Amino acid sequence: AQPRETWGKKIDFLLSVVGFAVDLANVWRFPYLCYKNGGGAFLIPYTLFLIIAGMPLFYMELALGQYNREGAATVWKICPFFKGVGYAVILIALYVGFYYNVIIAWSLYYLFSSFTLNLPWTDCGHTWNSPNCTDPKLLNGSVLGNHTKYSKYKFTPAAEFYERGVLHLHESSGIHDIGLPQWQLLLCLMVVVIVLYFSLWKGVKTSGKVVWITATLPYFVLFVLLVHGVTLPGASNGINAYLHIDFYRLKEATVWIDAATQIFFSLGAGFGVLIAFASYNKFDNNCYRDALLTSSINCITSFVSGFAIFSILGYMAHEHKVNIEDVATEGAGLVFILYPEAISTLSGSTFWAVVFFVMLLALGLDSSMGGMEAVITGLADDFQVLKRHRKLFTFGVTFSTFLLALFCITKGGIYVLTLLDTFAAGTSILFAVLMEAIGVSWFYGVDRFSNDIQQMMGFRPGLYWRLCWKFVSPAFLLFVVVVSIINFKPLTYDDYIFPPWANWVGWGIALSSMVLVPIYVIYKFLSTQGSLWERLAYGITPENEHHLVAQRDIRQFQLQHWLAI
Amino acid sequence: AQPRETWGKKIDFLLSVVGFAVDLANVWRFPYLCYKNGGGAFLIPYTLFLIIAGMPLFYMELALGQYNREGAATVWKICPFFKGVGYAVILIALYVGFYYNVIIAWSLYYLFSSFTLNLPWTDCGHTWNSPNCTDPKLLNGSVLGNHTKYSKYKFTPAAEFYERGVLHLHESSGIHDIGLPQWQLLLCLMVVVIVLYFSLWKGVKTSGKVVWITATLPYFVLFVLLVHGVTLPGASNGINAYLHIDFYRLKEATVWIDAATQIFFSLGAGFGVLIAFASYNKFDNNCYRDALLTSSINCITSFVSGFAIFSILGYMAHEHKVNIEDVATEGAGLVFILYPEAISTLSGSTFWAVVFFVMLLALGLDSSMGGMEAVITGLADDFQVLKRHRKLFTFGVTFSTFLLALFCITKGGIYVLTLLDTFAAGTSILFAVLMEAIGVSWFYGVDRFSNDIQQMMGFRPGLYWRLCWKFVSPAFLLFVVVVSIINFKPLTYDDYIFPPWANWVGWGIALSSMVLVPIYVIYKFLSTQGSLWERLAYGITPENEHHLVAQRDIRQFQLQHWLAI
Ligand SMILES: CN1CCO[C@@H](c2ccccc2)c2ccccc2C1
Ligand SMILES: [Cl-]
Ligand code: NA
Structure with missing residues (x-):
C-alpha cells in the first residue's frame, strides 16, 4: 500500500548515526575498567575490537539493511531460521531505552537545578542538597585534615546531590527494598517520554530535524571544555595519566567483555538501530564511507572524552586530597559527579553547567530515540497492522517504557538501572552479533552478500572484510561469549553486594532474549509441513x-x- | 459466523450459577453479620433486600444476558452510552480475580499441609510454622490465659501458621516494603492458574462439567460437618446465639446497610458473570425461575453454613470456657485460624481438615472460573479477533492474572489484597451496577425489557418486577453508594494503619473506573458525526x-x- 519511507536529506542519515552513536560520555567509564598492573586497559581492546569487529559488523549491518529494505526482524526473510535474533535485538533496544530514559531524566533534573545562580555543588549548607551532616566535609570550602580514606568522595556536595539529592539512595537499602518512585524523578521521566513521543509519533522525517540540533550541540559543547581541560593548574597531570604508553606491558589488554559491549553500544551493532536506519536509506548509498566515518568519529570522540574526563579527574586530584585511582566517584553517574565539580570552580559556572547539561540531555534524547525507533520499525515491519497505526503504537511503546522504568527511577532504582541492564546488555548483544556472525556468513553466504553489495554499488568488499565477516568476527564473538560465561563475577555496586537471587534474575532476563533464536527455529521446524x-x-x-x-x-x-x- | 456454543444441558448452567453464588464469603461473613446485627433478627432486612433489590438484579442480569446473547461489555448495544460500564465490570472482575486466586492458593497450601498426619497448626515448636520467638503458647492445653479476646490473640499455633507460616508477614511491615513473592505460594498460585486454564481453555463445553463436581463438593462436606455440628458438645450455645431473636437491633442504621452490602456482595449481581453465563443459554430458558432458584439456594446455603460455623464456634467456646462473642469473628483470618484448630480438636483431624480444605478449594475455584469467564466472554465478543484462538487468549489472561498477583502473594501481600478488595470491589462494582440499572430501566426502558422477557418465556413480568427495576433498585444502589462514600473510613489492618497514599491509590483505581465509564461516554459522543x-x-x-x-x-x-x- 504505502511506499517505503525515506530520509529527507542524505546528510540527515550521517547526522542521525552519530546522534545515536554519541553515548561515550556516561557509558565511557575508564576508571571502572581500569588497569592494576597492565597499563593500557581499555584503549587497546577498544581499538582492537573496533578494527577487527566494529567496522566489519557495521558495514555488514548497513549493507544488509539497505539491500533487504526491511527491519531488524524482517531482514531474516533472507534466512527465516535465524529470525529470532530480530526479536532479540528488539528486546535489547527496549531494555536499553528502559534505563536510558532514567539517565535522560537525571540530565533534565540537573539542567533544571543548574538554573540557580548558586550551584548546589558549591557549598554543603543544604544548598539544594540532602546531607546527613555526619560528613559534609568540603575541601576547598573548609580547610581540614587529610583524612582521605583512599579518597572517599561520596560525601562531596556534587556526589551528595547526585546519590541523595537526586537519587535519594540513602532511604533505600538495596535491590531487596527499592522503595517508592521519587515524585520529581517521576515528573522528569514523564517530560522525557512526552518529548520522545512528540518526536517519534509522526515518523523519521520529523526526527530528522531534531537529530540535527542534538548532534550539532555536542560538537560545540565539547570544545569549550577541551580548551579548559588542562588550563587548570593541576589538571595537566590528568593528561599525563591518559597517555600511558606500554609497548609490551599489559595485563588484560586485547581481551575484555566490557570493551566489546562498549564498542557495540557506541556503534549500535546488535541493536537493530543500524538496520532500521538503513531501511529508510535509499538503495544507492555508500555504506563503506559512512561506516568508516562513523568509526573514526567514535574513536576520536572516545579519545577526547577520555582526555577531558582525565583532566577533570586530575584537577579534582590537585584541588582536593587525593588517592590517584579513587579520587573520582564510580557508578553510572561519572559525568554528573565529575563535570559539575570542575564547572563550579570555573568562573561563570551557571553558563558552563547549563550548556553541559543541555548537551547531555540532547545526546541522551537522541540515543533513546534511536533505540526506540529500532523496536518501532521492527515490530511495524513484522506486523503490518502496527505499520497502519504509527501514532497509537508509538504511544503504546512509550507508555510501556515509562511504566517499566518505575523500578529504575525509585529510591533504589540505580541498583537495578545498571545491574539488570548490564547483565542483559552484555550477554544479549554478544549473542545477537554472535548469531549474526553466523547469519550472513555461513547460512546466507559471504559470497551472496558480496554479490549483493557489488550489485548495490560498484566497489566490492576485499579479502579483509570477507575474512572478518566469515572467520575473524564469529571466532572473536564466540571467544567473548565463552569468557563472559566462564569468567563471570557477581555484580556489585561501590559498596553494596547483590544477593544470589539478583544474579539469577539478571541471567533469566538475559536468557529471555537469548532463547528467542532457538524458539523461532523450533517454531519454523514445526510449522513447515x-x-x-x-x-x-x-x-x-x-x-x-x-x-x-x-x-x-x-x-x-x-x-x-x-x-x- | 459460528453459532455460540450453548450449554450441553440446563443443569450445567443451573449448577454454575450456584457455584458462582456460594463461596467463602457466604461462610465467613454471613454468620458473623447475623450475630452482630440483631442475632436472630437479621433476615428481616436480608430477605426484604433480596426480594426488592437482590432478586430483581439477578433477574435483570439473566434476562439481559439471555435476550442479548453477548458478553458483559458487548451486551450494551441497546444503549451505546453505557457500553463503558461493560468494560468497568470486566476490569472489576480482573482486579478481584487478582486477589481471589491468592485465597485459593492459601486454601491449596492448607490442604497440602493437612495432607500429613500431624497437622502444623496442632502444636507449636516450629512445626512447619514460623514461631514468633515470644513463647508461642498452647491454645488452652498448657497456658490457661484467656482473659483477653481469643480471636485477637495471635499466639495460637493456627494464627502463627496463618500469618507467619503461610503469609510470612513477619518479614514485612506494610505496603511500603512488600518484599519478594513466596516460592511455595508462587507454586500454589501457578498450579491454581494452570488448573483454571485447563478448565477454561475450551469454554463452557468443558468447564461446566468441572463445576458439576463443585456443585456437589461443599454441600456434602457441609452436610457431614452439619452432622458433627449436632454431635459436638457445646454447639447448642452457638445454635441459640445464631438465631437469638433481638427485635430491638433493627432500629440502628448499622444493621440495614450491612445486610444490604451482604446481599449485594453474595448474590454477585452486576459482575458480568451472570450476563456471560446467561448468554450461552437458549432463547426459551426461563430465567425467572432460574434466578429465583439460584437466590434461594444461595440464601439457604448461607443459612445452613451459619449453623455449622456457629456449632464449631460453640464447641471451641466450650473447650475454651469463653463466650460466643469472643470467638465470633469474620473473614479468611477467622476461618483459617479457628476451623483448623477445631478440626485438630475433633476426632479424625486429617479427614475433616482435608474435606474442609477441599470444600474451600471448591468454593474458590468455581468463583474464580466464573469471574474469568466473564472477562473472556466480554473481551471475546467485543473484539472478534479474540473470538478464535481461545487457547491463547485464556492463557494470556491467566498469565497476566498470575503476574499481577505477585504483589498479593508476597510477604506483605495481605495489605494490597485488602486494599484492592475493599476499594475496587465496593466502589467500582457499586457504581457499575448503579449505571447498569439506570441504563436498563431509564435510558432503555422497563417496558421494552418486559416485552423482551415475554418474547423469551411467554409471560410478561407484572407490576412488582417493573417497579423493583426502575424505582426500588436504582434508589437502593444510589443509597448504598452514598453510604459507602460518606461512611468511608481510612484503610486499616488488625494493628497496621494504612498510610494516606494507599487510600489515595485505592480511590485512584475507583475513580479510574468511574471516569473510564464516562470516558467511553464522551468517546461515543465525540466519535459520532x-x-x-x-x-x-x-x-x-x-x-x-x-x-x-x-x-x-x-x-x-x-x-x-x-x-x-
Ligand atoms: C457473587 N460473587 C460472590 C463470589 O464471587 C466473587 C468474584 C470473584 C472473581 C470475580 C468476580 C467476583 C466476589 C468477590 C468479592 C465481592 C463480590 C463477589 C461476588
Ligand atoms: Cl450471603
Ligand atoms: Na463455588
Whole structure:
C-alpha cells in the first residue's frame, strides 16, 4: 500500500548515526575498567575490537539493511531460521531505552537545578542538597585534615546531590527494598517520554530535524571544555595519566567483555538501530564511507572524552586530597559527579553547567530515540497492522517504557538501572552479533552478500572484510561469549553486594532474549509441513527462493557454498 | 459466523450459577453479620433486600444476558452510552480475580499441609510454622490465659501458621516494603492458574462439567460437618446465639446497610458473570425461575453454613470456657485460624481438615472460573479477533492474572489484597451496577425489557418486577453508594494503619473506573458525526434501530418514555 519511507536529506542519515552513536560520555567509564598492573586497559581492546569487529559488523549491518529494505526482524526473510535474533535485538533496544530514559531524566533534573545562580555543588549548607551532616566535609570550602580514606568522595556536595539529592539512595537499602518512585524523578521521566513521543509519533522525517540540533550541540559543547581541560593548574597531570604508553606491558589488554559491549553500544551493532536506519536509506548509498566515518568519529570522540574526563579527574586530584585511582566517584553517574565539580570552580559556572547539561540531555534524547525507533520499525515491519497505526503504537511503546522504568527511577532504582541492564546488555548483544556472525556468513553466504553489495554499488568488499565477516568476527564473538560465561563475577555496586537471587534474575532476563533464536527455529521446524529435508530447506533458504525447494536445488546442502569465501 | 456454543444441558448452567453464588464469603461473613446485627433478627432486612433489590438484579442480569446473547461489555448495544460500564465490570472482575486466586492458593497450601498426619497448626515448636520467638503458647492445653479476646490473640499455633507460616508477614511491615513473592505460594498460585486454564481453555463445553463436581463438593462436606455440628458438645450455645431473636437491633442504621452490602456482595449481581453465563443459554430458558432458584439456594446455603460455623464456634467456646462473642469473628483470618484448630480438636483431624480444605478449594475455584469467564466472554465478543484462538487468549489472561498477583502473594501481600478488595470491589462494582440499572430501566426502558422477557418465556413480568427495576433498585444502589462514600473510613489492618497514599491509590483505581465509564461516554459522543441531537440519539438509541435518528423517531426524547411503568 504505502511506499517505503525515506530520509529527507542524505546528510540527515550521517547526522542521525552519530546522534545515536554519541553515548561515550556516561557509558565511557575508564576508571571502572581500569588497569592494576597492565597499563593500557581499555584503549587497546577498544581499538582492537573496533578494527577487527566494529567496522566489519557495521558495514555488514548497513549493507544488509539497505539491500533487504526491511527491519531488524524482517531482514531474516533472507534466512527465516535465524529470525529470532530480530526479536532479540528488539528486546535489547527496549531494555536499553528502559534505563536510558532514567539517565535522560537525571540530565533534565540537573539542567533544571543548574538554573540557580548558586550551584548546589558549591557549598554543603543544604544548598539544594540532602546531607546527613555526619560528613559534609568540603575541601576547598573548609580547610581540614587529610583524612582521605583512599579518597572517599561520596560525601562531596556534587556526589551528595547526585546519590541523595537526586537519587535519594540513602532511604533505600538495596535491590531487596527499592522503595517508592521519587515524585520529581517521576515528573522528569514523564517530560522525557512526552518529548520522545512528540518526536517519534509522526515518523523519521520529523526526527530528522531534531537529530540535527542534538548532534550539532555536542560538537560545540565539547570544545569549550577541551580548551579548559588542562588550563587548570593541576589538571595537566590528568593528561599525563591518559597517555600511558606500554609497548609490551599489559595485563588484560586485547581481551575484555566490557570493551566489546562498549564498542557495540557506541556503534549500535546488535541493536537493530543500524538496520532500521538503513531501511529508510535509499538503495544507492555508500555504506563503506559512512561506516568508516562513523568509526573514526567514535574513536576520536572516545579519545577526547577520555582526555577531558582525565583532566577533570586530575584537577579534582590537585584541588582536593587525593588517592590517584579513587579520587573520582564510580557508578553510572561519572559525568554528573565529575563535570559539575570542575564547572563550579570555573568562573561563570551557571553558563558552563547549563550548556553541559543541555548537551547531555540532547545526546541522551537522541540515543533513546534511536533505540526506540529500532523496536518501532521492527515490530511495524513484522506486523503490518502496527505499520497502519504509527501514532497509537508509538504511544503504546512509550507508555510501556515509562511504566517499566518505575523500578529504575525509585529510591533504589540505580541498583537495578545498571545491574539488570548490564547483565542483559552484555550477554544479549554478544549473542545477537554472535548469531549474526553466523547469519550472513555461513547460512546466507559471504559470497551472496558480496554479490549483493557489488550489485548495490560498484566497489566490492576485499579479502579483509570477507575474512572478518566469515572467520575473524564469529571466532572473536564466540571467544567473548565463552569468557563472559566462564569468567563471570557477581555484580556489585561501590559498596553494596547483590544477593544470589539478583544474579539469577539478571541471567533469566538475559536468557529471555537469548532463547528467542532457538524458539523461532523450533517454531519454523514445526510449522513447515514436510519431510526433514524439506523442513531444513525451507529453514535455510530465502523466502523468495522457496520454489527452488520444490525443484530439489539447495546451495547450502553442498559444501562448495560453505567453502566459498 | 459460528453459532455460540450453548450449554450441553440446563443443569450445567443451573449448577454454575450456584457455584458462582456460594463461596467463602457466604461462610465467613454471613454468620458473623447475623450475630452482630440483631442475632436472630437479621433476615428481616436480608430477605426484604433480596426480594426488592437482590432478586430483581439477578433477574435483570439473566434476562439481559439471555435476550442479548453477548458478553458483559458487548451486551450494551441497546444503549451505546453505557457500553463503558461493560468494560468497568470486566476490569472489576480482573482486579478481584487478582486477589481471589491468592485465597485459593492459601486454601491449596492448607490442604497440602493437612495432607500429613500431624497437622502444623496442632502444636507449636516450629512445626512447619514460623514461631514468633515470644513463647508461642498452647491454645488452652498448657497456658490457661484467656482473659483477653481469643480471636485477637495471635499466639495460637493456627494464627502463627496463618500469618507467619503461610503469609510470612513477619518479614514485612506494610505496603511500603512488600518484599519478594513466596516460592511455595508462587507454586500454589501457578498450579491454581494452570488448573483454571485447563478448565477454561475450551469454554463452557468443558468447564461446566468441572463445576458439576463443585456443585456437589461443599454441600456434602457441609452436610457431614452439619452432622458433627449436632454431635459436638457445646454447639447448642452457638445454635441459640445464631438465631437469638433481638427485635430491638433493627432500629440502628448499622444493621440495614450491612445486610444490604451482604446481599449485594453474595448474590454477585452486576459482575458480568451472570450476563456471560446467561448468554450461552437458549432463547426459551426461563430465567425467572432460574434466578429465583439460584437466590434461594444461595440464601439457604448461607443459612445452613451459619449453623455449622456457629456449632464449631460453640464447641471451641466450650473447650475454651469463653463466650460466643469472643470467638465470633469474620473473614479468611477467622476461618483459617479457628476451623483448623477445631478440626485438630475433633476426632479424625486429617479427614475433616482435608474435606474442609477441599470444600474451600471448591468454593474458590468455581468463583474464580466464573469471574474469568466473564472477562473472556466480554473481551471475546467485543473484539472478534479474540473470538478464535481461545487457547491463547485464556492463557494470556491467566498469565497476566498470575503476574499481577505477585504483589498479593508476597510477604506483605495481605495489605494490597485488602486494599484492592475493599476499594475496587465496593466502589467500582457499586457504581457499575448503579449505571447498569439506570441504563436498563431509564435510558432503555422497563417496558421494552418486559416485552423482551415475554418474547423469551411467554409471560410478561407484572407490576412488582417493573417497579423493583426502575424505582426500588436504582434508589437502593444510589443509597448504598452514598453510604459507602460518606461512611468511608481510612484503610486499616488488625494493628497496621494504612498510610494516606494507599487510600489515595485505592480511590485512584475507583475513580479510574468511574471516569473510564464516562470516558467511553464522551468517546461515543465525540466519535459520532452530526448535530447535537443526532449525537445524543446515536448515544442513546439502540444499534439495532439507528434509522429512527434520520426519521426523527427517537422515543427517548419523549415524556412517555420516562413516564412508562
Ligand atoms: C457473587 N460473587 C460472590 C463470589 O464471587 C466473587 C468474584 C470473584 C472473581 C470475580 C468476580 C467476583 C466476589 C468477590 C468479592 C465481592 C463480590 C463477589 C461476588
Ligand atoms: Cl450471603
Ligand atoms: Na463455588
